[PDB]
């Protein structure tokens, strides 16, 4: 009885984690952003000095 | 985190396109005044 009280506490608590990664997959990639940030950044400090 | 990373995204593309419309535009002036600057030689003793 304890072992399933405690089973099904980590089964709600797995499903709050996939309910929230589920969210967090309907977004692009992190790293990815970060590159074409960085691409970005210099992209446009090159237009802004020509500019 | 990615929701500020895609909206900063979304503003530099903004701010791309700003430079890019400052660029032309600029480009045009830049134009423009060497036109002027043409004109000018062509009305110039000395």
Same mark, same amino acid.
Not at chain 1, 36 to 48: F, M, N, R, V
Not at chain 2, 2 to 16: D, G, I, M, T
Not at chain 2, 19 to 42: G, T
């Given at each position: 009885?304890?072992?399933?009280?405690?089973?099904?506490?980590?089964?709600?608590?797995?499903?709050?984690?996939?309910?929230?990664?589920?969210?967090?997959?309907?977004?692009?990639?992190?790293?990815?952003?970060?590159?074409?940030?960085?691409?970005?950044?210099?992209?446009?400090?090159?237009?802004?000095?020509?500019? | 985190?990615?929701?500020?990373?895609? !909206?900063?995204?979304? %503003?530099? =593309? $903004?701010?791309?396109?700003?430079? *890019?419309?400052? #660029? !032309?535009?600029?480009? %045009?002036? =830049? $134009?423009?005044?060497?036109?002027? *600057?043409?004109? #000018?030689?062509?009305?110039?003793?000395?």
């Amino acid at each position: 009885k304890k072992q399933i009280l405690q089973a099904k506490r980590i089964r709600k608590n797995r499903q709050e984690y996939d309910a929230l990664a589920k969210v967090i997959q309907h977004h692009p990639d992190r790293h990815e952003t970060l590159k074409e940030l960085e691409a970005l950044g210099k992209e446009l400090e090159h237009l802004s000095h020509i500019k | 985190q990615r929701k500020r990373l895609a !909206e900063k995204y979304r %503003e530099c =593309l $903004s701010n791309k396109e700003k430079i *890019l419309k400052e #660029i !032309e535009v600029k480009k %045009e002036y =830049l $134009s423009s005044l060497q036109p002027r *600057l043409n004109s #000018i030689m062509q009305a110039s003793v000395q």
